[PDB]
Amino acid sequence: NPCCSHPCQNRGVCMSVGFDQYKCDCTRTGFYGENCSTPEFLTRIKLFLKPTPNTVHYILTHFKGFWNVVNNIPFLRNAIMSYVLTSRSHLIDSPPTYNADYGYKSWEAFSNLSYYTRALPPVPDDCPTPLGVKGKKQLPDSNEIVEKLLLRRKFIPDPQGSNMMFAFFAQHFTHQFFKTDHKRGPAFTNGLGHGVDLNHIYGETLARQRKLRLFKDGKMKYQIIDGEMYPPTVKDTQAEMIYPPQVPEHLRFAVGQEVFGLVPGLMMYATIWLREHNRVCDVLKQEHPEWGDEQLFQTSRLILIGETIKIVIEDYVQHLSGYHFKLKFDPELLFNKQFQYQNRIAAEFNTLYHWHPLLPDTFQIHDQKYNYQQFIYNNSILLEHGITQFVESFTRQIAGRVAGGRNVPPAVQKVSQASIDQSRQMKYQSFNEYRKRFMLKPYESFEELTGEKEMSAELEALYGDIDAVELYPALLVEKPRPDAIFGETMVEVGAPFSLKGLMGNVICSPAYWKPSTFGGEVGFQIINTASIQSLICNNVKGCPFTSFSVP
Amino acid sequence: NPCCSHPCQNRGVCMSVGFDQYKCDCTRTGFYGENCSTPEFLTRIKLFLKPTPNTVHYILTHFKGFWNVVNNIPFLRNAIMSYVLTSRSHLIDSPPTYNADYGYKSWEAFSNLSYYTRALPPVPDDCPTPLGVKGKKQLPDSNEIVEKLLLRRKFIPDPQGSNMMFAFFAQHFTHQFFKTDHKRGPAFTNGLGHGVDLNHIYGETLARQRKLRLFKDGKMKYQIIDGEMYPPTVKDTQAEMIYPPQVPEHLRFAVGQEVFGLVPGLMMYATIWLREHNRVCDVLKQEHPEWGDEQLFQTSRLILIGETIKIVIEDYVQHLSGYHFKLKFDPELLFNKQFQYQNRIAAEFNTLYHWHPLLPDTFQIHDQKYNYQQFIYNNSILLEHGITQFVESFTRQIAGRVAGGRNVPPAVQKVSQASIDQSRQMKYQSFNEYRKRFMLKPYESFEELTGEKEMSAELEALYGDIDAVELYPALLVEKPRPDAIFGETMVEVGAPFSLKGLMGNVICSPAYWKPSTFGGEVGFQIINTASIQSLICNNVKGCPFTSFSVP
Ligand code: COH
Ligand code: COH
Ligand SMILES: *[C@@H]1O[C@H](CO)[C@@H](O[C@@H]2O[C@H](CO)[C@@H](O[C@H]3O[C@H](CO)[C@@H](O)[C@H](O)[C@@H]3O)[C@H](O)[C@H]2NC(C)=O)[C@H](O)[C@H]1NC(C)=O
Ligand SMILES: *[C@@H]1O[C@H](CO)[C@@H](O[C@@H]2O[C@H](CO)[C@@H](O[C@H]3O[C@H](CO)[C@@H](O)[C@H](O)[C@@H]3O)[C@H](O)[C@H]2NC(C)=O)[C@H](O)[C@H]1NC(C)=O
Ligand SMILES: CCCCCCCCO[C@@H]1O[C@H](CO)[C@@H](O)[C@H](O)[C@H]1O
Ligand SMILES: CCCCCCCCO[C@@H]1O[C@H](CO)[C@@H](O)[C@H](O)[C@H]1O
Ligand SMILES: CCCCCCCCO[C@@H]1O[C@H](CO)[C@@H](O)[C@H](O)[C@H]1O
Ligand SMILES: CCCCCCCCO[C@@H]1O[C@H](CO)[C@@H](O)[C@H](O)[C@H]1O
Ligand SMILES: Cc1cccc(Nc2ccccc2C(=O)O)c1C
Ligand SMILES: Cc1cccc(Nc2ccccc2C(=O)O)c1C
Ligand SMILES: *[C@@H]1O[C@H](CO)[C@@H](O)[C@H](O)[C@H]1NC(C)=O
Ligand SMILES: *[C@@H]1O[C@H](CO)[C@@H](O)[C@H](O)[C@H]1NC(C)=O
Ligand SMILES: [N+]
Ligand SMILES: [N+]
Ligand SMILES: [N+]
Ligand SMILES: [N+]
Numbered sequence A, B: 001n002p003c004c005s006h007p008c009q010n011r012g013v014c015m016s017v018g019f020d021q022y023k024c025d026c027t028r029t030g031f032y033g034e035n036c037s038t039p040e041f042l043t044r045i046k047l048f049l050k051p052t053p054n055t056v057h058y059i060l061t062h063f064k065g066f067w068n069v070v071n072n073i074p075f076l077r078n079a080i081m082s083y084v085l086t087s088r089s090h091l092i093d094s095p096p097t098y099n100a101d102y103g104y105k106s107w108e109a110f111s112n113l114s115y116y117t118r119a120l121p122p123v124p125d126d127c128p129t130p131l132g133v134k135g136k137k138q139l140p141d142s143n144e145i146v147e148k149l150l151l152r153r154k155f156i157p158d159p160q161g162s163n164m165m166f167a168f169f170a171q172h173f174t175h176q177f178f179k180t181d182h183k184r185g186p187a188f189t190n191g192l193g194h195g196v197d198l199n200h201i202y203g204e205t206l207a208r209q210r211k212l213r214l215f216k217d218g219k220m221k222y223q224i225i226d227g228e229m230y231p232p233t234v235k236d237t238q239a240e241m242i243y244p245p246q247v248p249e250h251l252r253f254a255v256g257q258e259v260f261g262l263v264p265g266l267m268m269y270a271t272i273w274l275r276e277h278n279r280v281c282d283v284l285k286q287e288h289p290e291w292g293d294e295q296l297f298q299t300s301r302l303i304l305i306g307e308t309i310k311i312v313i314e315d316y317v318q319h320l321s322g323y324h325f326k327l328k329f330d331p332e333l334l335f336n337k338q339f340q341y342q343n344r345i346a347a348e349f350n351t352l353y354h355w356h357p358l359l360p361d362t363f364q365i366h367d368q369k370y371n372y373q374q375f376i377y378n379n380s381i382l383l384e385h386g387i388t389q390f391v392e393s394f395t396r397q398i399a400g401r402v403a404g405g406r407n408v409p410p411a412v413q414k415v416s417q418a419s420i421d422q423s424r425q426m427k428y429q430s431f432n433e434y435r436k437r438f439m440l441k442p443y444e445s446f447e448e449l450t451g452e453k454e455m456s457a458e459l460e461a462l463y464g465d466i467d468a469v470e471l472y473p474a475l476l477v478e479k480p481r482p483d484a485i486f487g488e489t490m491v492e493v494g495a496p497f498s499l500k501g502l503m504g505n506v507i508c509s510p511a512y513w514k515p516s517t518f519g520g521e522v523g524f525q526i527i528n529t530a531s532i533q534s535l536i537c538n539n540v541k542g543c544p545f546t547s548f549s550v551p
């Protein structure tokens, strides 16, 4: 297959012609030529006027005094935020195109929601090398890559100060649309909503939802333990959960997402959002005494979806980005722009979000320490300390740095290996191919990638060619930005997927973004004043201070 | 329920406040006031400068010599057609909102693809009238309305000259997205693609597709009978079909849509499109000897989808509109506009497309006369005369007029009644409410509706109030436009739905609309040079002349 070398540049579409030749389709790439390598008139200009991502990043993370002014000039702040949304979203095809089984457009790839979609097509079946033509005939041993490059020896803390509230929010939030269906394969998902539908709270299906709802006052089932609201159990709901045999039945809490019993950090957020849902039911009831259970439930769900997107942009991404510019959740920024209110979760989004280096060597709640053997699947801990203590402890405990290499806890070593194996099963293209896909200059040496000698040396021995390094390993060994949690590629590839999943949501469409959609102005206000602090304050006893970074 | 009266005007959203008050959300309506009845300044100008639908109709249906010069000026034709698309499309909510079970926005209604969506919310469960407040407590008897207003007396021809090639094309084409799931009820659909995916050719599920495919050269299974290609049998495919016990096994044709064995008219088009798919496979094979069966099949499907959209716009709608303006299928017209590339089939679009008055009293094939007793479920008639004979005959036989009342054949009488009963099951609002929903002045009198004295009297007898008249009856009895098949309301409610289903297709999106998507320039040209005449000419022996109008 002549397309195995990935000849077409700048989003050009490669197509085989006969057995020995290829054709690049350069339609609307802004380029032309055999390989779509020659820039057009208008393309030379924007390229000249476009600073590098690292330059833009420096600007957004400095000049605090300047941004304090910009952040308070609404016309300016909106124009900037609007530009961030549109420019990043242009990098995603919507409606979606490829998946693991189709490196060409097809109705099957478009219509079948059980697949993760793909930002880059899979490496065709019969190629010289696994990645195309670069590198050796076989890829290096995945177990070796993890130990040599990803396995943690010494815990490296996040210089941005990310805490465990951040780490567990990340896992909780993203696991509503990263729901890999392993009984089918890594190419497939159980998240057919393909975005922020809060299925990890209400369940993926109506049958599961019904098991979790109280069907009174629009509320969800719950328990009162030690004076505080907690999720129901498997027994009471008959809603299935993944628990190992060890865990006694009375500690088998049932929430929307089947795997959230895995770790108390997830159950913490599961509990908090559950409280939030029922809290919002009470507010809506006061607002609408004439409403029934169904409209109370449905309306509350739309509120919490709004709250989620609000919090994710203005607190979560805000901290993550390190920007001094104040991001804004405001659907109206797009009502005069071209934008598709739909989303399809990309497999590569899933891969890059394996942020397991975030995880500490031990989990510290109050004055006690827990290793992974004690902490995992142990809801006794949650009940022992309560949510307030959890929030206070997690707010204080620093998370690990994601980029920079060698920071994956040994406890989750096999997860990193599987992430590599599965990406090979799905025939991912190389790291440099994904750099180019998101308008980044490909790395020219291993030393350039890591900005260092030790790992870059190990990498050269394992892959041989820089164009043979795989996506996932490279993301975790890449040179971090100055005092940043991530390197360039993580940010530049992840941001488009994220914002598309957030603003692509139906509630952001002009037909939905009305107070009536949310039961009036009171309901609408809950969304537009939501923050991670107010979420904790309204639902956690004592209203402890919280944040996504350490005090 | 204060919203029972439908207080809010101009797309404003009604919401209950307490047990006896209502609030109207006027956001982005261009209106304000308690009921969104007060136009803004700009709204008033627009309102003053906009010509009535009956005006734009008259212009487009006259000045023949003028349109010829327009039609031959690209810039002008493109600009006109571009406006045609955007203007109508703004009338549809996309992504969708309501369904039969939800008169308020909810995640269940948005996300659950098994529902037809709703352009107008259902009447609340407990209003004074089933239509709200207007009308008698009980709706008029379904049977009487059919007999008094809809049932045929003498066959009324279509002034626009629509033939049976048009009548059966309409049934075939629309039945890929009108797939009512009567197992669940009239509110539900089996067409989860919600548009033009050609599932009626290839099957709704992958399992049914595999039963119909040959898995050689991308082709679909078929029989050669009398030297001509026909669809395969149920026995050779195991693809279940709806057939009465009488039908012999060898005449049990299997095609994508389970119900297409119901009339030879459907099976004719099913045959023709089947030939077209296999014809396109041959073309692509010549273009791509290196391609496998899978890529050959998928690319052919995308080509046939485009073919379908091309034909429907530039031939089918082109005829139905009666416009002298040459309609154009050109996705490129929207690449600079705001437009959502997605669609959800509206229940009202289903209800309005019940064009059973199109049907003749007998079907004329060649030199013979078949009534409904001998025509229905009779695939032998198809093999007797063959496709070429069916085409030549159906091109000649005139279809019945849809608007004007009293032109529904007695055979499909119970269907016309069912269409009314189910509309009540799904709690449709009144005809006049749907008038307003699509920017049409509501009718003030029964005589204004029909433009006639006899039927109007029967309507007033049955309903009493003009605002108590139902959607489906009124659509049929409405005054037809001058020598036209339909009245004002049919066109103005139907066109938005149709164009949304056509241009909202993923292949019209910028990422898909390029030659590489369809195997190159050759495949691309098949779409862009397709027509109803070319369809028949390439797949029907003798290349008979055909059209959607009698010569
Ligand atoms: C911020 C991101 C984040 C965090 C904090 C996190 C925290 C933790 C954690 C304790 C806190 C544990 C014990 C694990 C352990 C696992 N994680 Co994560 N994970 C995270 C991101 C992910 C993602 C993304 C996946 C893939 C999801 C899928 O496909 O369903 C994942 C998958 C897994 C798997 C599945 C392995 C496989 O073979 O597919 C295990 C096991 N893990 N992780
Ligand atoms: C141009 C439009 C058109 C045509 C030519 C047509 C031609 C014919 C035809 C012979 C040529 C016959 C015997 C029928 C008879 C029927 N049609 Co139509 N139908 C048409 C538009 C529709 C539509 C739209 C539906 C609803 C589809 C659904 O929901 O599944 C329908 C449904 C039906 C049903 C379903 C039963 C019910 O409960 O309504 C019957 C029976 N029929 N139709
Ligand atoms: C889309 O909406 C459909 C209509 O509500 C929904 O179908 C409904 O699903 C529920 C739950 O699966 C069915 O109720 C079930 O109730 C008992 C359990 O208490 C079961 O034993 C029954 O067999 C029954 O399945 C409703 O009967 C069913 N309604 C129908 C088919 O009309 C779909 O599930 C919704 N789709 C999704 C993806 O959630
Ligand atoms: C979306 O893509 C999925 C992957 O291709 C697809 O699942 C596949 O479905 C087929 C047919 O249902 C399964 O094949 C079946 O073959 C025999 C018949 O000979 C059955 O008896 C078997 O039980 C088997 O189900 C594939 O095994 C299956 N592949 C998987 C699960 O990986 C989905 O059907 C597609 N979705 C839609 C809506 O079409
Ligand atoms: C269109 C807005 C452009 C104004 C911002 C100009 C920022 C200049 O910044 C420059 O960018 C170069 C690469 O981007 C770097 O090599 C230089 O070190 C840096 O000074
Ligand atoms: C309008 C004022 C422009 C200021 C731009 C400053 C450019 C700083 O330079 C940046 O420093 C980074 C390291 O800190 C490097 O990684 C970047 O490549 C480099 O562009
Ligand atoms: C708890 C997750 C949702 C957070 C939404 C913000 C709720 C914070 O609290 C709210 O502050 C408002 C001030 O405008 C008050 O009107 C509300 O009564 C109060 O509950
Ligand atoms: C069969 C329904 C789709 C019709 C596609 C066009 C059919 C006309 O026929 C096509 O005309 C072209 C000349 O322009 C030739 O290149 C093709 O070989 C020929 O098949
Ligand atoms: C604008 C911006 C800047 C930096 C990071 C992000 N977002 C991400 C980047 C990488 C990975 C994930 C995200 C995310 O928000 O989930 C955004 C949206
Ligand atoms: C532009 C135009 C004008 C008049 C009728 C239509 N289309 C329809 C109108 C009513 C019912 C159906 C349709 C249709 O295309 O199916 C169009 C698209
Ligand atoms: C779970 O946590 C409790 C404290 O809440 C502890 O006593 C117990 O030993 C833990 N379980 C395991 C297996 O370590
Ligand atoms: C079906 O059509 C054939 C002629 O093609 C005719 O002989 C036969 O009687 C028809 N069947 C019925 C039930 O009328
Ligand atoms: N740089
Ligand atoms: N369940
Ligand atoms: N551990
Ligand atoms: N089937």
Ligand SMILES: [N+]
Pocket (backbone or CB within 6 Å): B371, B372, B373, B411
């Ligand atoms: N008949």
